């Protein structure tokens, strides 16, 4: 009942929930792997389709 109200009661609300650098590295790694897998599936599509 009270936890969220306390969290909104903290002194500085513009720096609450600022992501660490590791989350920023993992974001780019996940997007890079996503585009790589898409391109690989597109090429296998071109090969089989002929």
């Amino acid at each position: 009942s009270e936890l969220l109200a306390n969290l909104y009661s903290c002194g500085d609300q513009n720096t609450l929930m600022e992501e660490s650098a590791e989350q920023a590295q993992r974001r780019d790694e996940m997007l890079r792997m996503y585009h790589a897998l898409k391109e690989a599936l597109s090429i296998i599509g071109n090969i089989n389709t002929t």
Binding site: S1, L4, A5, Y8
Partner: protein, 50 residues
Amino acid sequence: NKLQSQLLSIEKEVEEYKNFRPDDPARKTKALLQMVQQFAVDFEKRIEGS
């Protein structure tokens, strides 16, 4: 003692009512999270028996 009991009963709520401002996103989001947690607990209660 009568008046003391009445104040004790009412205080926990008027504590919130006295700070009301209609333009308060924090209240709206806290209400949203409270309603969602209530719904998910009632639903699990009726289905699982938990």
